Amino acid sequence: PEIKIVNVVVSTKIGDNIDLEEVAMILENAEYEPEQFPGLVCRLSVPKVALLIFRSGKVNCTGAKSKEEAEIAIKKIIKELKDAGIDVIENPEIKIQNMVATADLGIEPNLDDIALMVEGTEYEPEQFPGLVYRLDDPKVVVLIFGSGKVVITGLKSEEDAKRALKKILDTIKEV
Amino acid sequence: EIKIVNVVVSTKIGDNIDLEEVAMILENAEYEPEQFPGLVCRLSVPKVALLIFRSGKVNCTGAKSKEEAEIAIKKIIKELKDAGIDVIENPEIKIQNMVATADLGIEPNLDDIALMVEGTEYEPEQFPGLVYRLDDPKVVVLIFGSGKVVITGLKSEEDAKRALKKILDTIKE
Amino acid sequence: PEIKIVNVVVSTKIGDNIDLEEVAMILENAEGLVCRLSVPKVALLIFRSGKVNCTGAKSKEEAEIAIKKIIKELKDAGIDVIENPEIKIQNMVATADLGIEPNLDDIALMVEGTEYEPEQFPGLVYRLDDPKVVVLIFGSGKVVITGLKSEEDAKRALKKILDTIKEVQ
Amino acid sequence: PEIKIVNVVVSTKIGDNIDLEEVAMILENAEYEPEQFPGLVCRLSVPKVALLIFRSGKVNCTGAKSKEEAEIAIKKIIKELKDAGIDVIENPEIKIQNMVATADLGIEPNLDDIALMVEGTEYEPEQFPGLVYRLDDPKVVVLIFGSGKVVITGLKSEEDAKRALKKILDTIKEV
Numbered sequence: 001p002e003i004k005i006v007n008v009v010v011s012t013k014i015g016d017n018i019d020l021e022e023v024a025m026i027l028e029n030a031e032y033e034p035e036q037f038p039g040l041v042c043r044l045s046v047p048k049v050a051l052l053i054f055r056s057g058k059v060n061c062t063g064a065k066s067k068e069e070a071e072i073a074i075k076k077i078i079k080e081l082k083d084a085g086i087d088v089i090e091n092p093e094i095k096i097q098n099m100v101a102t103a104d105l106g107i108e109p110n111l112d113d114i115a116l117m118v119e120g121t122e123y124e125p126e127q128f129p130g131l132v133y134r135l136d137d138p139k140v141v142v143l144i145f146g147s148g149k150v151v152i153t154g155l156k157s158e159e160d161a162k163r164a165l166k167k168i169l170d171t172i173k174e175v
Numbered sequence: 176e177i178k179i180v181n182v183v184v185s186t187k188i189g190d191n192i193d194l195e196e197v198a199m200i201l202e203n204a205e206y207e208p209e210q211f212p213g214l215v216c217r218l219s220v221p222k223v224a225l226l227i228f229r230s231g232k233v234n235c236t237g238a239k240s241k242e243e244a245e246i247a248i249k250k251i252i253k254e255l256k257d258a259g260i261d262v263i264e265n266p267e268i269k270i271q272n273m274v275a276t277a278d279l280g281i282e283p284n285l286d287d288i289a290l291m292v293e294g295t296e297y298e299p300e301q302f303p304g305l306v307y308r309l310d311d312p313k314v315v316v317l318i319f320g321s322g323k324v325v326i327t328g329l330k331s332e333e334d335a336k337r338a339l340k341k342i343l344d345t346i347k348e
Numbered sequence: 349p350e351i352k353i354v355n356v357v358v359s360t361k362i363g364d365n366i367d368l369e370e371v372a373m374i375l376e377n378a379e380g381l382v383c384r385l386s387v388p389k390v391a392l393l394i395f396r397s398g399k400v401n402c403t404g405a406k407s408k409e410e411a412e413i414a415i416k417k418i419i420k421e422l423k424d425a426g427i428d429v430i431e432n433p434e435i436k437i438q439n440m441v442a443t444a445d446l447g448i449e450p451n452l453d454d455i456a457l458m459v460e461g462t463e464y465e466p467e468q469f470p471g472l473v474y475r476l477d478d479p480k481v482v483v484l485i486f487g488s489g490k491v492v493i494t495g496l497k498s499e500e501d502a503k504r505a506l507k508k509i510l511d512t513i514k515e516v517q
Numbered sequence: 518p519e520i521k522i523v524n525v526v527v528s529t530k531i532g533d534n535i536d537l538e539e540v541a542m543i544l545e546n547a548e549y550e551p552e553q554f555p556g557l558v559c560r561l562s563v564p565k566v567a568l569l570i571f572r573s574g575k576v577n578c579t580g581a582k583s584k585e586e587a588e589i590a591i592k593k594i595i596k597e598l599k600d601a602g603i604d605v606i607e608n609p610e611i612k613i614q615n616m617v618a619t620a621d622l623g624i625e626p627n628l629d630d631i632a633l634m635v636e637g638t639e640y641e642p643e644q645f646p647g648l649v650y651r652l653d654d655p656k657v658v659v660l661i662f663g664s665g666k667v668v669i670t671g672l673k674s675e676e677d678a679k680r681a682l683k684k685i686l687d688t689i690k691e692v
Contacts, residue, residue, distance in 0.1 A: 012478075013477070013478040013479075013480070016477065016480060056480075057480075089477055089478065092478065093478050
């Protein structure tokens with residue numbers, strides 16, 4: 001009946017007008033094909049994250065379990081580039097773009113009843129698992145599974161995750 | 176390329192509905208006034224469910240189309256009217272939601288998309304498929320590794336096509 | 349404080365390998381090829397490459413109107429054009445009011461990446477790295493933010509500016 | 518067109534754990550409000566330069582016409598603190614952090630032309646005088662006025678100011 005943040009998506013900027021051809025030589029597991037895509041994708045083994053680095057120096061990062069874990073990943077790559085003589089932003093702003101939270105309702109819900117009794121939900125066991133439920137405040141998408149597991153996506157903060165859960169729990173309560 | 180798999184519809188069938196009597200009239204009707212104030216009636220063929228309130232409000236799920244829902248509703252209304260309940264004979268049926276499906280034709284790289292397209296969420300350990308929430312039109316899109324796309328929150332088949340176009344354009348752009 | 353977008357610069361592509369000398373025949377006004385519209389009041393610079401640059405629009409949508417209107421003219425004269433081309437914001441000017449009149453000498457000493465020299469230019473110049481913008485701060489408290497690619501970035505820029513200036517006064 | 522340096526911003530470190538209360542006791546024109554702001558401000562009249570001094574020993578100095586002028590001012594302050602019995606480094610290295618350079622194009626530029634034809638420029642005469650032009654090498658901000666006056670900021674060296682001027686001139690030439 002409590003929020004667990006399980007993954008975050010973060011944006012940052014680690015430099016300006018970066019030479020991606022040089023970056024691709026420095027970094028490990030760096031995929032760079034300028035004829036096919038503009039960005040460079042770096043998949044870190046430790047921590048287990050993927051980073052997309054643009055010539056502008058903007059970076060998108062997926063896979064981290066938390067902001068702090070994304071921060072380690074980002075700063076590890078900043079150090080690699082700095083050490084190789086790239087001009088970097090050494091303590092970048094790490095902005096949360098998305099958070100994914102889980103909770104367990106503690107009961108196995110009847111998704112057919114929810115789908116019929118709660119407005120703005122959909123459910124089609126043949127097409128996808130679980131029930132989809134969009135909230136307007138906070139602006140999230142909620143997935144509720146037969147196990148009682150709940151997944152909240154689109155979140156901007158842990159506080160919003162808490163607000164989301166209250167609303168979910170209060171709506172399910174009638175049912 | 177858009178196929179509608181289910182609809183959710185609403186209607187208004189009357190004003191002062193005695194749910195206890197409705198429960199006597201309809202087969203397989205779930206009514207427990209203390210727990211929830213609405214009556215549930217589930218049909219097996221078609222696999223369609225109605226929720227009926229004392230206010231006369233009706234919600235309906237499980238139908239493949241608005242027309243199939245309308246047939247379900249009309250049948251139930253006739254049972255109630257014949258028993259003596261004051262109901263509206265031809266109520267207006269309003270689409271509240273849909274599940275629409277499409278195929279990309281390719282097996283997409285969801286990792287790339289989650290990395291490359293802002294406003295998407297992909298966490299395969301939680302849920303298969305990428306979640307892509309839109310505002311114009313206001314829909315939730317799920318994209319699967321197979322290339323299957325499910326579009327939910329729709330109010331019409333034409334918003335589905337707007338949604339699908341924006342999806343395809345974004346994954347290109 | 350609220351941000352006002354005062355101008356945008358947008359780029360697009362209306363095709364490839366345009367013959368500019370024959371474009372000046374179709375579009376009234378054409379000094380690549382410079383074209384000036386009255387409604388909306390915008391200017392467009394078209395290269396043979398197909399690239400278009402546009403200044404003067406209040407918004408992306410105003411620019412979109414001007415580009416679409418000149419596309420529809422080129423189309424009819426037999427030039428091969430893209431009808432709904434992707435338009436991209438290249439720059440903006442955003443303005444805000446701090447809500448206080450700042451001490452520009454205080455900021456120039458106490459905040460790094462600022463310069464101030466009233467005899468050469470009015471206002472204090474403040475460079476940010478993320479978002480990568482140039483900010484002009486005036487004694488009136490008025491700020492001008494340039495180098496922007498989005499309104500979200502203008503919001504992010506102002507938050508950082510206000511926060512740094514709160515630390516000064 | 519020739520570069521004139523009009524001002525410099527310099528930094529240095531004058532010691533390790535400087536007692537700012539005692540610095541305020543001896544520097545005339547010293548502003549120190551530790552509850553409001555951690556640094557001490559000293560504003561010199563001759564020459565018109567200002568210093569910001571931190572407990573870390575970090576010093577930032579604005580107003581000087583040159584690095585040397587700034588160093589002279591800093592050493593005068595150091596002598597007072599040394600004379601006062603405050604532990605200071607007597608031979609600090611003065612680092613240029615910023616400079617304002619000016620030049621004259623020799624022509625009265627058509628700023629509207631430049632705003633259209635040169636990328637990374639902005640011009641909004643109702644909001645500010647001059648056209649704003651950012652360079653990435655050297656990393657500077659340039660303001661160009663209808664008079665032909667050019668101001669270059671963000672400079673780390675006089676040599677970089679010259680390199681900036683060549684690029685500005687080359688750009689205007691193409692317009």
